[PDB]
Design a protein around this ligand. Structure first.
Ligand SMILES: [Mn+2]
Ligand SMILES: [Mn+2]
Ligand SMILES: [Mn+2]
Ligand SMILES: [Mn+2]
Lengths: 294, 294
């Protein structure tokens, strides 16, 4: 397979997306990741190296990619995400500037040759084309909406003692899973107190709050995707694409580009420009795995 | 570019070679290494991630992040090797210890876009083909031979107070640069005492020895090679290949393989078989970078 990738600032005043594509030829695997940072870049910077190291370390301990055990691979990937977040929060606490209020979502794909695994938190999305037809692979982690996934996130956020207004946890964050975001995790009580001093809430209001767990978590959903001959390409992208283009349209567009010139990098660059043409207001990051089939 | 690799035990009763190939598509960077361990695998095991981590770190530190002059890259690679060795020596002592007399040679290729760097200690070898002709990229670090490099190694080993018998420092080690080998570095006076206790040499003989520096060092030679279109492929391999096949024959063989079927992995596998056919008695490891020219 071949990679196409692009990651551009677009119309935003800062670039907080990043992409990683790394391969181990000896162990026949690749790692691709889209990170969509928010409220600064410190979390993305941390992830850009730390997350690969931890995921690969976890998969190599016991040769998990080789022995075909999904449950074991899922366990390892979740543990890796959670470990990285714990270390990120420590880093944020020790290098804090507070607010360093940064965080990042993450959509990761590991491929080893016939199978791929997706590990996902947040609001980027991964999809594939199977015999011309789109299949969406990930679910958004949003504290609103009508999907089963949405209902479950709202349930979790509320059980943690959080509240939601206008689709935002504590009227603040509109994604319910992410790396970083320490004020919704280990520093949530300080958050409340800061809110009182700032005039967001009343002392009376915050005195009534009881937290039982983190409102935002870094625990990923893991998906197994066998790379059967009918799987033509896979796209990982940030919401700078998906918020501005229907996913079926994205897949059809990439299909057409590849038919036109067979060049996945060119296809990827063209797609990003189409997002901008459709007035995308966000950073845009896109990774396409062209599997050289159809 | 495409990678071919093979790493086989051959007729040895243990496998002490290893290979690493890691690529980063977004930064157009890759790292490839051949390690030939001796007297155990502990040094190779350490180097497998530790040398990579240190080299990648170094080449992204400070200004190097934007390229850098050759002198600065050379200094960074040398310091990285030397740092890794210091940490390896500490390690060998703190873990599992004695007699851990392990060590390892290392030949590393880093590709940063259109330029390659070779960083080398020991007696693996790297070569390239330019328009069908061989160019050797590395010198053997052996305390024997007639080459200029050989003369230099012998001179350094003697200045440090070492002596050489039958191609071997203190009748023991047959390479003059390597990772690990603590008994030729920080524990050399203890080596002498040990030799006395074990009957290897007299107390009188050792009393006259005065060490001024390490006999074996981890300081690499660094070479820069522009990756122009006439550079067809680059081969890194352990001496299990080179001791049994002329280097010009290796290059011709690989050229003929690629011309015939265009498959670098098959070329690599076939080459290793030729080494076995030529009565190689050692572990054999080979990495071929096929740069994809006509
Ligand atoms: Mn963002
Ligand atoms: Mn975004
Ligand atoms: Mn060996
Ligand atoms: Mn050898």
């Amino acid at each position: 397979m071949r990679w196409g990738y692009t990651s551009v600032q677009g119309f935003r005043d800062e670039m907080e997306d990043d992409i990683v594509i790394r391969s181990d030829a000896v162990d026949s695997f690749s790692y691709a990741a889209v990170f969509d940072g928010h409220a600064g870049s410190s979390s993305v910077k941390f992830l850009r190296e730390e997350l690969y190291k931890e995921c690969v370390g976890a998969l190599q301990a016991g040769s998990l990619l080789n022995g075909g055990d999904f449950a074991a691979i899922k366990e390892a990937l979740i543990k890796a995400f959670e470990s990285v977040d714990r270390n990120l929060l420590k880093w944020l606490e020790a290098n804090g500037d507070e607010e360093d209020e940064s965080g990042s979502t993450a959509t990761v794909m590991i491929i080893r040759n016939d199978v791929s695994f997706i590990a996902h938190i947040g609001d980027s999305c991964a999809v594939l084309s199977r015999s011309g037809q789109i299949e969406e692979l990930t679910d958004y982690h949003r504290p609103y909406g009508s999907s089963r996934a949405a209902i479950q996130e709202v349930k979790r956020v509320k059980e943690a003692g959080g509240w939601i207004v206008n689709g935002r946890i504590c009227g603040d964050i509109a994604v319910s899973r992410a790396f970083g975001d320490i004020r919704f995790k280990t520093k949530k009580n300080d958050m409340l107190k800061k809110g009182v001093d700032e005039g967001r809430w009343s002392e009376k209001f915050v005195s009534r709050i009881e937290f039982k767990g983190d409102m935002v978590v870094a625990t990923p959903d893991i998906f197994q995707v066998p790379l059967t001959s009918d799987v033509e390409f896979i796209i990982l992208a940030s919401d700078g694409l998906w918020d501005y283009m229907k996913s079926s349209d994205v897949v059809s567009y990439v299909r057409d580009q590849l038919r036109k010139h067979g060049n996945v990098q060119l296809a990827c660059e063209s797609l990003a420009q189409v997002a901008l043409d459709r007035r995308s207001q966000d950073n845009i990051s896109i990774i396409i795995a062209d599997l050289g089939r159809t």
